[PDB]
């Protein structure tokens, strides 16, 4: 059965003996599960010979070892004779006789495109719509998406799409991921004396060719992208195996006095009252703080948490790589960096390199932002609830960075500088669709002409743990018991689905009136035909999803005997 022995199979077949493909031999074996051979097996054991006459070849091993020998002899000879006749020819006629014959190989470099929509000739695009549609629509009340972007576990929208659709990066997607993850930096000038222009390894500064990027980095890219084990370095050393908590213990015997400042001692006195004794040391001026029997301490302990896996932005992703200054990175919550990168990368996808160009066309009061979040600056909330408790050093303005509307404020204060509407929705898992519902109405109401819509959320210890306690997220210890790897734990509409996989990042779209979009000559990725929200009904389970959005299909059917002339575009055109 073929599929090392294959090379001589044809040799054997010359003896009048049949070798089989896997398919042929499978067919033969399924011949033994036919009802008449099953009946036959139940009477007495059945010996099937599926050998193909190979028994009748005498001394098969010496016949087989011969056929190898002739094939390897003939190969190996012809190879040596061809290398010696090459070497003769080349010594007689010199190396200059094989120089005009020799040829040059062009190696591909990554030429990353922006994938603007392909615009068909006006003949072809006129055919798809009805003839009546021309001048029927008010283009001021048609909302189009002109740009979009995202920062997510697969990097940009470009790279996410390559992995969603084809499950493997192209050279262009592989270079973009290497650039995003900081494996490759660009270099233009002197590098080991010689002048070099192109990609270099970010660590070793060694030149890297675009062809080599995939062999050199793809394994590391796929390992540190997408849904994977939580990486403590990305989440402020958080480690779900060792989740730090504190247990209130009552002291049973007086502690060894420790040295603290005068303000720290009087703070210890004020808390513990008579259960502590603070005394000045005359020499140093520092105080001695002695906790007495009955005083309250907090001893750290480490709980082991069962949610080990998340959809994390690729390891090495840095807002510096996109040009955000350290003054902004140190100031804002991590989530705001996702939003700033999404918004510029959305404006670039709409061909708007300078947001102020929008103010050639619309008033500063006509560029809205309607993006929002479920939880907002959760790293700032940790700072102001947990890190401030533990008297860790936290910026004075941490509260401002916590607020869900703040990300949109930074987008205005750093990029857009508009006086347009600002209507930040909070929709939990449906925030982005509520954001579009709002953005559209903001435009149709005249209150804006361009709007930024989208959502963003970060992933952090506290939220991870609360989605755990609520049993919303997949228990990663159960998923391991079932042999699921991280890459197969988010399995929608599957029999064995057992909770969602948490992730982080942002997604932004630019929407505007079609009339304006055509006038600015921005790309138009699609039309937002409808956008609605809906609550469900009386209940007691806040997480429980319901059938409210069914309301978008509401239509009366008590009188449907004759077609309503209002649906017929030719009738509407005639009235216009």
């Amino acid at each position: 059965t073929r599929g090392a022995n294959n090379i001589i199979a044809e040799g054997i077949e010359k003896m009048g003996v049949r070798t089989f493909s896997q398919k042929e031999m499978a067919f033969n074996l399924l011949g033994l599960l036919t009802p008449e051979v099953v009946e036959l097996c139940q009477k007495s054991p059945v010996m099937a010979d599926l050998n193909g006459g190979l028994q009748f070849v005498p001394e098969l091993k010496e016949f087989t070892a011969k056929l190898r020998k002739e094939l390897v002899e003939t190969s190996e000879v012809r190879k040596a004779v061809s290398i010696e006749t090459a070497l003769e020819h080349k010594v007689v006629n010199g190396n200059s006789a094989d120089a005009a014959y020799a040829q040059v190989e062009i190696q591909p470099r990554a030429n990353i495109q922006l994938d603007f929509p392909e615009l068909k000739p006006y003949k072809q695009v006129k055919q798809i719509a009805p003839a009546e549609l021309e001048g029927l629509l008010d283009l001021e009340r048609v909302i189009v998406v002109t740009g979009f972007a995202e920062v997510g576990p697969w990097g940009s929208a470009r790279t996410r799409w390559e992995m969603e659709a084809f499950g493997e990066f192209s050279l262009e997607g592989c270079v973009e991921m290497a650039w995003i993850m900081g494996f490759i930096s660009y270099h233009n000038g002197n590098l080991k004396g010689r002048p070099y222009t192109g990609w270099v390894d970010s660590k070793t500064k060694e030149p890297v060719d675009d062809k080599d990027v995939k062999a050199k980095y793809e394994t590391s890219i796929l390992e540190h992208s997408g849904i994977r084990l939580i990486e403590p370095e990305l989440f402020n050393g958080y480690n779900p195996e060792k989740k730090e908590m504190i247990q209130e213990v009552i002291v049973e015997e007086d502690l060894e006095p420790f040295e603290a400042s005068k303000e720290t001692a009087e703070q210890f006195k004020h808390q513990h009252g008579d259960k502590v004794d603070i005394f000045e040391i005359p020499e140093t001026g520092e105080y001695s703080v002695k906790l007495l029997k009955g005083a309250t301490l907090y001893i750290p302990k480490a709980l082991r948490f069962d949610r080990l896996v998340a959809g994390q932005i690729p390891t090495g992703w840095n807002a510096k790589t996109y040009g955000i200054s350290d003054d902004i990175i140190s100031q804002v919550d991590p989530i705001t960096l996702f939003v700033l990168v999404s918004v510029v990368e959305a404006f670039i996808a709409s061909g708007i390199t300078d947001p102020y160009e929008m103010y050639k066309y619309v008033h500063v009061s006509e560029v809205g932002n309607c993006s929002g979040s479920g939880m907002g600056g959760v790293s700032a909330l940790r700072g102001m609830f947990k890190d401030r408790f533990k008297d860790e050093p936290v910026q004075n303005d941490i509260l401002q960075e916590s607020f869900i509307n703040t990300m949109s404020a930074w987008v205005n204060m750093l990029l857009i500088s508009s006086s347009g509407p600002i209507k930040t929705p909070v929709g939990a898992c449906a925030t982005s669709v509520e954001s579009v519902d709002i953005g559209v109405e903001t435009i149709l109401s005249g209150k804006a002409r361009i709007c930024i819509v989208g959502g963003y959320d970060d992933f952090q210890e506290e939220g991870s743990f609360e989605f755990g306690n609520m049993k919303a997220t997949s228990n990663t210890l159960e998923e391991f018991e079932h042999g699921r790897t991280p890459a197969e734990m988010s399995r929608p509409a599957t029999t064995t689905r057992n909770g969602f996989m948490e992730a982080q990042g942002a997604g932004i779209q630019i929407i505007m009136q079609a009339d304006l979009a055509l006038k600015m000559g921005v790309p138009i990725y699609g039309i937002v035909a409808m956008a609605a929200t809906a609550t469900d009904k009386i209940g007691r389970s806040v997480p429980a999803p319901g059938k409210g959005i069914l309301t978008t299909a509401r239509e009366h059917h008590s009188s449907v005997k004759y077609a309503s002339p209002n649906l017929n575009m030719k009738y509407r055109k005639r009235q216009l």
Binding site: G11, G16, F27, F56, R78, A80
Partner: protein, 182 residues
């Protein structure tokens, strides 16, 4: 070597053939419209067998819609998919309430080894000359060879017109004289 590997909790069940039938049809439909599968390719007959083995009323309605709403005028590849589609529907209606069948229609290959000038060993699986179905493979097996000795012609449309070979799939060929007589 003797480390336990088995656990009940790692068992993966696959039974959603109702859903895969529709994906299998749709993927064939678009592969034919994009000219990835032609009216000669055997993979068109193989996929039409695997669709009929999953025939139910839901799938028939899926075919009826997607084929009836194919515009013939858009190209040769749309007229092809519409003709094949109409056949595949007739077939799927006939073999509704019929047990599904293991029916291999792949091209039976033989071994071929070749040594070029430079002594490179090339192994290819080349289509056999006398044998181009399984029916012919069974006849070839039944005759044996010269070394084994001690002391029919059925018209098929494989590799020419896949649509005509599909039209024949539900038709249970009656064997007048068995290959065991040859």
């Amino acid at each position: 070597g003797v480390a336990t590997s088995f656990s009940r909790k790692k068992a993966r069940t696959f039974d959603s053939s109702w859903n895969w039938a529709k994906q299998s049809l749709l993927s064939l439909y678009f592969e034919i419209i994009h000219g990835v599968l032609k009216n000669v390719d055997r993979e068109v007959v193989s996929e039409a067998i695997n669709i009929m083995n999953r025939s139910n009323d839901a799938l028939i309605k899926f075919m009826e819609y997607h084929i009836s709403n194919t515009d013939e005028t858009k190209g040769e590849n749309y007229q092809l998919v519409k003709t094949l589609g109409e056949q595949l529907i007739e077939n799927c209606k006939q073999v509704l309430d019929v047990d599904p069948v293991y029916k291999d229609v792949a091209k039976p290959t033989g071994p071929k080894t070749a040594i070029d000038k430079n002594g490179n060993i090339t192994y290819s699986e080349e289509p056999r000359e006398k044998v181009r179905k399984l029916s012919q493979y069974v006849q070839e097996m039944a005759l044996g060879g010269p070394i084994t000795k001690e002391s029919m012609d059925v018209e098929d449309a494989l590799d020419k017109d896949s649509t005509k070979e599909v039209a024949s799939l539900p038709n249970k060929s009656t064997i007048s004289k068995t290959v065991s007589s040859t």
